[model samples]
Target chain A: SAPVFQAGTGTDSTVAGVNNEANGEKSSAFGYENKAKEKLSSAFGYKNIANGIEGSAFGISNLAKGQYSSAFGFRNVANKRHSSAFGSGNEANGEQSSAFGFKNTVSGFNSSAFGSQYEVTGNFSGAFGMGEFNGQYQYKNEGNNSYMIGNKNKIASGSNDNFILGNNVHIGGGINNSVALGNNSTVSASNTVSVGSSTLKRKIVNVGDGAISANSSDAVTGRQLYSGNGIDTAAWQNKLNVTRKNDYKDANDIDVNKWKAKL
Target chain B: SAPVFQAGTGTDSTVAGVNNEANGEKSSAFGYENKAKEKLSSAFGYKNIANGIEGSAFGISNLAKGQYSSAFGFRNVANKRHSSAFGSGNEANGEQSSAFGFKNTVSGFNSSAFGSQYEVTGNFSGAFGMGEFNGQYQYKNEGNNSYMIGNKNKIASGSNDNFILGNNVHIGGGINNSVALGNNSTVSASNTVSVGSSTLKRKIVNVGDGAISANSSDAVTGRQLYSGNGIDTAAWQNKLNVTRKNDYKDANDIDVNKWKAKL
Candidate 1:
């Protein structure tokens, strides 16, 4: 018999990782930085192509096949040859994956969706994960690695690699690794960390542990920080001590490690 | 023949001073103080009283007699005389001048009615100067303590202690030597003199010309004097200069022999 491809089989015979198949003449896996061909499949493998393909799996047990099309993990398929479903649950039903509007398919490349009635039937569209593409554009591009903690947070179009913490926060304009604590705070600048009642222009670093040591590139240098020409060292030290005693007491405690382990 | 007093006659048969009648009883020469009686023909002299016995002349010449009265003075009773006329032209007939109030004997004692058309017409009432006596009680007792000094200024009945000065200033008190100045400014206190605007509380002493010297009670006290306690004495040099200057000035202007001869 021709080499039989069955789902949920052993390592070489299994289409993707679990209960998946790659039965067409050429088939492939899904996900970043992966490739396979000629009815070959793997879990989250990438760059799949096939002809007379029935099913090809990408996510766990998904299947994809076509003359030049592809499908990715977790119930993905490009039924026609030359059609493509670059992400999970991507289905292409037209001549090739790009022949119809849904032919060149990248169904939920970084997001998820589902369909209950039928497979995606229109041109230039297909279901991702489950249903229609109901997620916002930012959700569609960032995949499962992206999360938001507060209400009314928005990541503008084409935003990537951002984390947001507070309500009504915007992570746009190339901002990275920023945290906002109060309502409507934004971090539009890059490589900035903000923690306060509201957004502010200046950087505030509060440190207290009996003493602090800092250095700057300017001519004035000392064991004490903030001792430039007219800067007041005593005032800055006083402000740091107040902030540490009041705001960061728990974090400043030496037994933080013991409590963090229990937590 | 009846002895009548007549004017312009130097003999015993005629009377010379004014208003004398010839052949009148109780007639006398000038300056006689007496009364007339008994059907006398001439009337003359002063203070004469005539009684009822008819055809009697009581006043001086040109006199007529009432049925029971008397008269006195030159022209004292130029017309009627039974109603007695005491001073010149005084009549007892010009209204209330009749001393006889019905059947009563009209007697005027120390009473005088003088001036033309004047009368003393009450029973023991008299008028000393001109004008009519309309039955007012004018007492001349030495201790009466009542006097009037203006026309129509009557000491009304039972009213006392009233003094009028200038024209309208009336002082209704019994104080002595109460001076009213310019009609209204009354200085009523005893032993006090108000000179101009200054009211000197005590006796005004010497107001000196030169520097004043010290004394026990007062040192040249006057109004606007030194307001200081105790005595104030001029310095010895000042006293010496004052005495020396006076002596030198007097000596330089004098001729010694002429001064001695005049002395």
Candidate 2:
């Protein structure tokens, strides 16, 4: 004599003859409705079952268990994961990296957080040699493979393979490998070269034997020593003396010779 | 009988015998009037008288015995005596000499006249240097080239190239080569010389070497040397070096390097 439970009621089913139940003891419940309720509650999470599980969330929340993963937004969990992220506005997981925005991620590994801000932290694989603004990048760590030119230029090369021709250029050189032209130009190389305004050319004439050697003529040379006519030196000297004497001869008849003799 | 011998004029005293032979001379036959008329005519030399000289002026008119010695005017005989002028308007009685007009005479020998009224003249002499009214003598016997310095001047010499210095002057340059210094002055030498404002003194100052020699500090020295602090030999040296390098460079930059490197 156990209690008999009816099955398959139209609106209600009984379990051990209990009325207003969702199903009888042997009746199957509607699967689509329960699933709809669960999904709705999971999309909204406010009114829910009493015992909140420690790692439970709803509405695009993610839990992290690997080293490189994170759930980094509201109601998200980034727990000991590698390269993972989940949340509406959170980025969590990459190996040693992070990001935060709507539907953001750090999916590569290792670190995690829960916010719309950075959710993953630590050095990541693709982060080096990358800048947010206009910046340069290179494949190798050494200066052996870079070149630059033009105004405000640069060359990060190990060899002397860069040239700048205009004004205000800079060529960073290494081992006999740089040249700068024009004003305010710079060269930061070990064996670099630069030139200033000194190499201008001018024309000069030569007129004599001594001047044939790369030298200028003296001011008192043969050309300048005498006047146009090539008169003998002594003749001019004598002529000058005679002209002076004649100009000062005494007009009086008195004998200067006699006076001098007496003196 | 003795009475009868007394004859022709004896009848004057008495009628002694009328015709007793009438042999007495009749001394009283002429009357007093007739004898008086005859004596008057004889004394006046109008009639002849027995044993009396005829054609003779009896008074002092006979004293002038020489020929051609004339006494022309009344009582002008005083002028004829020893060639003197007696009357107020008398002239001398000599050839080429005259005393014309009032009380003038030829006081010198061989002196003639024209319009020298009341002028004194002597032998070969004249009133040549006298006064304004007097005129000069015109004869070769007077001195040559003589001239007076003043107005109404007299030529007392007959020499050439003579000059007078003043007005109303008398006599200048007594010899052929004489000079005078002042008015009415005369020169008596044969080769005299005189200087006036026309002479000039002709002597000039002699400019010896001291006048034109350069200052000690500015003197040039030997072998491209010079004094003075501002003279830059380095400029000339640089010019010479550049010229030498270019000429000897043979259109090459090698010599330029050598020169610049040395610098």
Candidate 3:
């Protein structure tokens, strides 16, 4: 593990560790095989580290190559000045970016990332949740300032169940941004936050009958009975047998018990 | 690259790098270190590379001379000039901030830390998620403003709703915070919720009614297609939900009766 150096000039520096070099006029390198090559740089940790003036690199196989830059954690890197790298397996490649969590990649300046497995390419944006679309071809979700929170948001259906099976409740595809909050509640409409039985149509059923129903035998049909005015004066007999006309049967033609029983 | 030095004093600067030095107005022996060599200031990090005119020795075992400063990430130091350090194993002996992600220690001013550990003393407040109570033990459950949206939410045999054993069916301990929605569905006064079968109190099951045997008069109860009038909706739903969940039947009904008597 040999760390090379080429000082800019002057002379006042320190390099401690096997195979490390302080190339800057005033630099220091500590740890195994580290290199502080700029006028004012500090590199510490194991193997080939710190390359820029005022740059700092520490940790195993980490690299800091920009002015005033820093790299920390195993295999992490900071490629631009005033930038930093923290956490394992993350990349901070923009000027002033920061990335964290498992396998998160940041290429936009002033950006922040948290949580596991996500890629961000929007400036000043932040991705702070679990892997939503870790390996998706849809890149539009990376628009600036956007964020999503939650885990396993990825739609990858390697197997049947991401966790639970819908069984009879296959809300699947078309539905968007709908939070199925209840045990078996559904949003009949779109884009609205709803709970149990939102507005939708279903069984009206005959729990106790919607309205009351009765028989009408003696009842004359509307058209024949309402043939207008003086037509059925007394015995005019307009509606087939007539209304006021002298009828064969009286008003109590049917048995009282019959109607009573019906009621 | 040779870093130049123009000490404003008659000999108080320090240069220890192969080609670097401490040329600030007033500082101790150092190379490539930046800023803060003002009498009370010290040089840290690779040296003139003390270089922290801000007197900041940051970068594990790194030091900053700036007063009220800090440092972090493995022996790194924030200058006495109100500096800070972040990342695992960083030292912030300065007046303010330092650290993020697992194992962090802060002293005075605004100390900070993330990672698997922390030593945040004071600086307003803000300890974000995941690791937020992530590794704590409160027994019953975590505090508020927190969520855990996942598969089933039934509270073991204790209650149906996370609040109460299922109104009709207590899914079990593994389930929590489900709306338990359906027709006439609602979460009971308990901490949990339930399906449409939330209310009725007795069995409305159509078991004996299945036979096509003529007379409707043979019915011992005022039965209808819908749930019986005074039936316990919860009890009925539980028999169904509980049964469906476990793939086991009758057992639920028997238990219901057992618990019913206790109630």
Candidate 4:
């Protein structure tokens, strides 16, 4: 049976269905038992709720409890300002953040979480894919301005400005400005990068030439240092030939027979 | 004049506005010239269109053309499955992707694009801020699982597993597992990290010591190598004293004048 809509008696509020409420000005509530409790808010689907100004909740049992926040999937919650939660059972409790996929939580400012069960708690960070360390339920990120993009990755507390990818990557606390790539990588120092563990080393191939100077700290290619300019064996040979030609004449080049007789 | 409403004749559909069409089952269309053309779809603003199942378009001239996609701002399009497009003039053309801010496009699987005029075409990659290259309109990323978080950054074609930050950074094609930080940085190698260009360099200050061993490829601190045991000047001087005391006696040391007289 088609359901009947009940427009709210409040000022400029639009509501539908029995027992639904749109009490705020310019608010809208649709479906059964929904509520839009503040101005410019909208609640759709069954049992959805929007409490703060300019909030929107769109799926069944979803709640947008913060100003300018949005919850889009079933059983999700947008709990703070300007947050967006998508997919089911997720929570975005941070300001200016977005949490997507199932059961993820982002509780820091200006952060993002994607995939299932990722928990990020620092500002300006992003976590993608599931982060479950062995028996742990969720992956955890507690660093600022950091990024983790694969399964079971972690950026520990006090770490900042780091980028880590692949499975089971972990960056220790107080580490900053580090990058870790590939599986099972770990970083404990700042301003450096690692692609393998202590016992698991991988060769870096297809390298290009780096700047060659005494003060340069760039990673040089193997072939570049082997044959570049004055560092080559041919250059040493040429310098030796020039010095012998100018400093020693053929007459002074000691004769083996005369040296032997004198001795 | 207030626009006239035409409620849809389809079962369980709700619609309002002039010439609007909500013809699919459980669809809703509101405002002028909008159309929700599939089941459970919604179009809420003027001239918006939703053509896929469970799609939603909410702003002026927006289009949600894929299943479970959402478009929320003016002239934006969510063109693939489970994609979300926010802000004006953006396009989320990949499956499970999101594009936020203005004029950005994400066309890879499970990717994201943020800020203005960025284009990403690699799977599991993200681009934040713009990627303009000196009068070129937009930044571009084409590497898999790579991330760019600053202005004018680029991860070139065939490069993968890279993380880049700061302005005007570029990682050339065929590079993998690399990281580039700071402004004007460039990398043309694999499994390396760079913080400077070919002509411009910057020191990595405040770096902690890395693991030191014969087989370790970690970047070591300058002081660790200079002051380590058996490598210092004091160690060399002590070894010299010990060798002279054992190899030569005091009588051999006083025979210089006798050798001169013989010559």
Which prediction has the highest DockQ against the true structure? 4
Second chain alone, TM-score for each candidate: 0.27, 0.24, 0.31, 0.83
Instruction: Give the interface RMSD of each candidate.
Output: 68.8, 74.2, 23.1, 10.4
In terms of lDDT, model 3 sits at: 0.43
Better-scoring candidate (TM-score), 1 or 2: 1
| Chain A TM-score of each candidate structure, as shown | 0.31, 0.20, 0.53, 0.81
* TM-score on alpha carbons, each prediction: 0.21, 0.17, 0.40, 0.70
Candidate 4 TM-score restricted to chain A? 0.81
Candidate 4 residue lDDT tens string, B196-248? 66676565544455554445465434344322322344454454343232122
Pairs of colliding residues, candidate 4: A131-A139, B131-B139
Residues A1-263 of candidate 3 have per-residue lDDT tens digits of 55434342336666655776667665677668777777666676788577776677767888888766677678888787556677787777776566776667778655556767766575544455655344652321243322333443322111111111111122333333233233333433323323334333222111211111243111111122112212323232232232221111123244556646754
lDDT of 1 by residue, B1-263 (tens): 43332322222222333443333332222223333333322233454443333322333442445543333344534223323333443344431122211111213321223222222222222222222243643322111112222222222222222222222223333342222222222333322222111221122222222233442211122211212222223452343233232233234344656746854
**Could you arrange the candidates by lDDT from highest to lowest?**
4, 3, 1, 2
B1-263 in candidate 2: lDDT tens per residue? 11111233234321111122211222211100111111111110001111111111111011111122332111222223234322122355444343321223444455432111223332453322112323433322234333322123344434544444322333344455444332223344455422111221111111111111222211122322222233333443332232243333353323344333323
Tens-place lDDT digits, model 1, residues A81-102: 4555432234555664321111
CA lDDT, every model vs. true structure: 0.32, 0.27, 0.43, 0.71
Candidate 1 iRMSD, 1 decimal: 68.8
Identify the candidate with maximal lDDT.
Answer: 4
